[PDB]
Design a protein around this motif. Structure first.
Motif, short mmCIF file in Angstrom:
data_model
loop_
_atom_site.label_atom_id
_atom_site.label_comp_id
_atom_site.label_asym_id
_atom_site.label_seq_id
_atom_site.Cartn_x
_atom_site.Cartn_y
_atom_site.Cartn_z
N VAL A 123 0.59 20.62 7.90
CA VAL A 123 -0.62 20.07 7.30
C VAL A 123 -0.25 19.42 5.98
O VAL A 123 0.35 20.08 5.13
CB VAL A 123 -1.65 21.19 7.04
CG1 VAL A 123 -2.89 20.59 6.43
CG2 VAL A 123 -1.96 21.97 8.30
N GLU A 124 -0.65 18.14 5.77
CA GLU A 124 -0.52 17.52 4.45
C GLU A 124 -1.92 17.39 3.83
O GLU A 124 -2.73 16.56 4.27
CB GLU A 124 0.18 16.16 4.51
CG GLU A 124 0.34 15.47 3.14
CD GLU A 124 1.68 14.72 3.00
OE1 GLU A 124 2.28 14.36 4.04
OE2 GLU A 124 2.12 14.49 1.85
N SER A 125 -2.20 18.22 2.82
CA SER A 125 -3.50 18.25 2.15
C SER A 125 -3.32 18.98 0.82
O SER A 125 -3.27 20.22 0.81
CB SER A 125 -4.57 18.95 2.98
OG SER A 125 -5.75 19.19 2.20
N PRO A 126 -3.14 18.26 -0.29
CA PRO A 126 -3.05 18.95 -1.60
C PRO A 126 -4.17 19.94 -1.86
O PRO A 126 -3.90 21.02 -2.39
CB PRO A 126 -3.04 17.77 -2.59
CG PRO A 126 -2.36 16.69 -1.84
CD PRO A 126 -2.91 16.81 -0.43
N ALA A 132 0.83 -1.19 0.00
CA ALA A 132 0.00 0.00 0.00
C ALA A 132 0.87 1.25 0.00
O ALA A 132 1.97 1.26 0.57
CB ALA A 132 -0.94 -0.01 1.21
N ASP A 133 0.37 2.30 -0.66
CA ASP A 133 1.13 3.54 -0.86
C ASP A 133 0.63 4.61 0.10
O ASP A 133 -0.56 4.94 0.10
CB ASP A 133 1.01 4.03 -2.30
CG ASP A 133 1.87 3.25 -3.27
OD1 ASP A 133 2.21 2.08 -2.95
OD2 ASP A 133 2.22 3.79 -4.34
N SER A 134 1.54 5.14 0.91
CA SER A 134 1.13 6.17 1.85
C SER A 134 0.57 7.38 1.12
O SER A 134 1.12 7.81 0.10
CB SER A 134 2.30 6.63 2.72
OG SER A 134 1.85 7.68 3.57
N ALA A 135 -0.48 7.97 1.67
CA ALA A 135 -0.92 9.23 1.11
C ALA A 135 -0.28 10.42 1.81
O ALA A 135 -0.58 11.56 1.43
CB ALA A 135 -2.43 9.40 1.20
N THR A 136 0.56 10.21 2.81
CA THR A 136 1.13 11.31 3.59
C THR A 136 2.65 11.19 3.63
O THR A 136 3.27 11.14 4.70
CB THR A 136 0.51 11.28 5.00
OG1 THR A 136 0.81 10.02 5.61
CG2 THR A 136 -1.02 11.44 4.93
N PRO A 137 3.30 11.16 2.46
CA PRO A 137 4.77 10.95 2.46
C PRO A 137 5.53 12.02 3.19
O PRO A 137 6.57 11.74 3.81
CB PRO A 137 5.12 10.94 0.96
CG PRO A 137 3.98 11.67 0.31
CD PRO A 137 2.76 11.26 1.10
N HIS A 138 5.06 13.26 3.15
CA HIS A 138 5.80 14.32 3.81
C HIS A 138 5.67 14.23 5.32
O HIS A 138 6.67 14.29 6.06
CB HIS A 138 5.33 15.68 3.31
CG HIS A 138 5.48 15.87 1.84
ND1 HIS A 138 4.47 15.57 0.94
CD2 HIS A 138 6.51 16.35 1.11
CE1 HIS A 138 4.89 15.86 -0.28
NE2 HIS A 138 6.14 16.32 -0.20
N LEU A 139 4.46 14.04 5.81
CA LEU A 139 4.29 13.86 7.25
C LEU A 139 5.02 12.62 7.74
O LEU A 139 5.61 12.63 8.84
CB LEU A 139 2.81 13.75 7.63
CG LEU A 139 1.90 14.95 7.43
CD1 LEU A 139 0.56 14.70 8.12
CD2 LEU A 139 2.56 16.20 7.95
N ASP A 140 5.00 11.53 6.96
CA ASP A 140 5.70 10.33 7.37
C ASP A 140 7.18 10.65 7.65
O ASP A 140 7.76 10.17 8.64
CB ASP A 140 5.62 9.24 6.31
CG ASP A 140 4.20 8.72 6.06
OD1 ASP A 140 3.26 9.06 6.81
OD2 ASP A 140 4.02 8.00 5.04
N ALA A 141 7.80 11.42 6.77
CA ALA A 141 9.22 11.74 6.93
C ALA A 141 9.45 12.64 8.13
O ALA A 141 10.39 12.43 8.90
CB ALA A 141 9.75 12.40 5.65
#
Length: 480
Positions: free
Chosen positions: A445-448, A2-11
């Motif tokens: 906040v991660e939200s395109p 599965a592909d994370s939708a929050t790559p920036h927050l994950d990092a």
């Protein structure tokens, strides 16, 4: 897989658990289920950008300021249990005080009894504009009978004289459920009664991340109450026979928090100097607290958070600030790791935009010279550093119209603490990117969808008018 939708927050999260694992929950916290608190008329009005003018050197359209005051009053007026405020000194005055008073009266008129904390940070010299017993009494008089229903704590605090540390966070949390935060400290400080207003930005949300802000304020108030008898550190004033409410949030609002929306957020702050010396749980192993104090990093996760947000960019970075460099000895001039992170990104071809406030309020040469010098370390020569910089940097001072100054002759100023990457993930808060050792707080906040509103409503217009000051602009071959 599965592909994370929050790559920036994950990092960023990964970095914060490495640096400040023991502060998770209190000084930083990742939550799901937030809502950016914009009405249905205007979906973007979670973005509280002041003054709100663009293209107009007379700033006719002040809807941003009007919307901020109304949101403060509305949020406080809906309080049923707690109101929690932090800012830099002085205590609220002018239009902010009017909005506090009106909201508290409206809550009291609906039958509510409230606990209210108001905390300001004071530079050790500014101890005239910081009399808490005076402020308590003036607020109590303005409230009238509504004061009968208010348990009040008011305090001014300085956590280190030697290391220049005191509260700089700007937070309004109601019932541990709604929160506003950002760079706006007061109406006058942003010159908002004026025809040369300062550009600034706050965000409003509801949900679990408002609880995070309450837990951050509990951390500052636990220290404030522990030190309430040290006149050199804290001046404290309370209504009636009320105690010092160290943990108003833990006590009166709960931990499990229902979701109000679908926005993931990392709340992150710092404790400056003099509250906590080190995160004893941290195994991080990377006087100058910004660049040469491991222990300071572990209790100031916001610094690592902001550098990690830069590092997470895959395509482009926009930075909007009062400045990137500090002019406050004994503070260092810049955050070395931050500039190195920006240099490594340009060395990879990631685009970097930096807009700072007019030095009048070069400032720009200092920034480009430093980025170039850090790039020279990476790329091996000044010529290769110039190639990487000129090809990937936009650098300018701020303008909100085609005029070089406001119509009334004063220069444009800006006070944002804003970072956005990949039109995806952004920080809005009180933490400047230039070196500073204060208590601060903000949200990542991660939200395109929200980041694209930030582009359309703030960063796109900002650049439309600021590009005219650019000393470097890869998009037009400018590199002076």
């Amino acid at each position: 897989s599965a592909d994370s939708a929050t790559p920036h927050l994950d990092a960023v999260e990964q970095t914060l658990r490495q640096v400040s694992p023991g502060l998770e929950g209190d000084v930083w916290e990742r939550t799901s289920g937030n809502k950016l608190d914009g009405s249905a008329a205007d979906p973007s009005d979670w973005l509280l950008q002041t003054p709100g003018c663009w293209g107009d050197d007379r700033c006719v359209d002040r809807v941003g300021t009007k919307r901020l005051l109304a949101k403060m009053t509305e949020n406080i007026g809906n309080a049923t249990r707690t109101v929690d405020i932090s800012t830099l000194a002085p205590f609220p005055n002018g239009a902010f005080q009017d909005a506090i008073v009106a909201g508290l009266k409206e809550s009291a008129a609906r039958g509510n009894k409230l606990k209210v904390r108001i905390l300001v940070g004071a530079a050790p010299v500014y101890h005239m504009n910081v009399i808490p017993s005076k402020y308590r009494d003036e607020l109590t008089a303005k409230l009238g009978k509504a004061a009968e229903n208010i348990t009040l704590n008011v305090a001014s605090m300085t956590t280190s004289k030697t290391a220049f540390s005191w509260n700089h966070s700007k937070i309004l949390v109601v019932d541990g459920q709604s929160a506003l935060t950002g760079g706006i400290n007061s109406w006058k400080d942003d010159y908002l009664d004026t025809t040369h207003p300062v550009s600034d930005v706050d965000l409003a949300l509801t949900g679990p991340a408002a609880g995070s802000a309450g837990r951050y304020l509990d951390t500052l108030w636990t220290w404030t109450c522990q030190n309430k008898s040290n006149i050199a550190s804290v001046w404290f004033a309370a209504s009636g026979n009320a105690g010092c409410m160290a943990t108003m949030h833990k006590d009166t609002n709960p931990k499990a928090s229902p979701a109000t929306g679908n926005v993931p957020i990392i709340a992150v702050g710092g404790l400056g100097v003099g509250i906590k010396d080190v995160d004893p749980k941290s195994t991080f192993r990377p006087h100058d607290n910004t660049n040469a104090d491991r222990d300071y990093d572990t209790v100031n996760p916001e610094e690592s958070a902001l550098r990690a947000l830069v590092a997470s960019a895959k395509s482009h970075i926009e930075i909007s600030q009062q400045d990137l460099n500090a002019t406050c000895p004994p503070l260092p001039r810049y955050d070395i790791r931050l500039y190195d992170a920006l240099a490594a990104k340009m060395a990879a071809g990631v685009k970097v935009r930096i807009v700072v406030s007019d030095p009048a309020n070069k400032s720009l040469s200092e920034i480009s010279d430093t980025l170039r010098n850090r790039l020279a370390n990476i790329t091996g020569s000044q010529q290769a550093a110039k190639t990487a910089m000129c090809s990937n940097l936009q650098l300018a001072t701020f303008r909100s119209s085609p005029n070089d100054k406001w119509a009334d002759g004063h220069p444009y100023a800006q006070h944002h603490k804003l970072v956005s990457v990949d039109s995806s993930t952004f920080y809005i808060g009180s933490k400047n990117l230039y070196p500073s050792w204060l208590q601060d707080f903000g949200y990542i906040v991660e939200s395109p969808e929200a980041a694209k509103q930030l582009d359309a409503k703030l960063l796109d217009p900002q650049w439309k008018y600021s590009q005219e000051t650019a000393t470097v602009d890869y998009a037009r071959g400018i590199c002076n």
